[PDB]
């Protein structure tokens, strides 16, 4: 096939494989119980972004959707990858601030909607409708990055500075990227088609690898992780 994307997804397999490696091989080595559950945690994300990454650049996770009188090449893969490690990334940072298991359920719910609503939106068929599912999975977000940024950090501050400083730089790259997400879709492939896949696959990847690896990397390498 040779899609024009596809050095992004190789360039995307490649980043979170490496990535998921030096985590795995850094969690092994922790004895502190507290740790080891951040890096199993923080492990699983990009594996599981790499395994779908790899299914993409091998030719699968990719569905033609009618729509604006085009056949539109829609990547579902990434959803199979989001669903699972958004929420991941979501506990990581619960865990950090001793969220509640209300709150953390809530939140993996409503992310859930998010994902689920974001695909449905990815492949509906009538064009004005792919937005409203947009409209709603991005409400979705934003009730998460709102409890982010008001729940969680409060109840950061019953932590010690250096896990209150942690959670605070972590929650800001996830403000910051989760918030990039919506846009590219509204402007992408799945949206108005203004940037083309192979441009949009690479904003993608530069957003996935930062919040996966990029995040592991600022989380694992912190003192905040010990129990
Ligand atoms: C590793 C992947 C991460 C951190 C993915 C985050 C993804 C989002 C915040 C996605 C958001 C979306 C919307 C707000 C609406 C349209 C569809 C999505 C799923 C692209």
């Known amino acids: 096939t040779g899609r024009p994307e596809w050095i992004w997804l190789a360039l995307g397999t490649?980043?979170?494989?490496?990535?998921?490696?030096?985590?795995?091989?850094?969690?092994?080595?922790?004895?502190?119980?507290?740790?080891?559950?951040?890096?199993?945690?923080?492990?699983?994300?990009?594996?599981?972004?790499?395994?779908?990454?790899?299914?993409?650049?091998?030719?699968?996770?990719?569905?033609?959707?009618?729509?604006?009188?085009?056949?539109?090449?829609?990547?579902?893969?990434?959803?199979?990858?989001?669903?699972?490690?958004?929420?991941?990334?979501?506990?990581?940072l619960a865990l950090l601030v001793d969220a509640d298991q209300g709150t953390i359920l809530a939140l993996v719910g409503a992310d859930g909607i998010m994902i689920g609503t974001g695909l449905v939106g990815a492949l509906t068929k009538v064009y004005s409708y792919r937005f409203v599912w947009w409209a709603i999975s991005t409400a979705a977000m934003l009730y998460i990055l709102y409890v982010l940024f008001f729940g969680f950090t409060s109840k950061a501050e019953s932590m010690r500075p250096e896990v209150a400083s942690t959670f605070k730089v972590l929650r800001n790259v996830t403000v910051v990227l989760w918030s990039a997400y919506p846009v590219v879709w509204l402007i992408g492939s799945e949206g108005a088609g203004i940037?083309?896949?192979?441009?949009?696959?690479?904003?993608?990847?530069?957003?996935?690898?930062?919040?996966?690896?990029?995040?592991?990397?600022?989380?694992?390498?912190?003192?905040?992780?010990?129990?």
Do not use: C, H
Not at 216 to 222: A, T, V
């Open 14 to 92: 490649a980043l979170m494989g490496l990535g998921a490696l030096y985590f795995l091989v850094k969690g092994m080595g922790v004895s502190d119980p507290d740790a080891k559950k951040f890096y199993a945690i923080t492990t699983l994300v990009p594996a599981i972004a790499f395994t779908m990454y790899l299914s993409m650049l091998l030719g699968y996770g990719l569905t033609m959707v009618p729509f604006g009188g085009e056949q539109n090449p829609i990547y579902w893969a990434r959803y199979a990858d989001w669903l699972f490690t958004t929420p991941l990334l979501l506990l990581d």
């Open 195 to 227: 940037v083309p896949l192979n441009i949009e696959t690479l904003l993608f990847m530069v957003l996935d690898v930062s919040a996966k690896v990029g995040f592991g990397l600022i989380l694992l390498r912190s003192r905040a992780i010990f129990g």
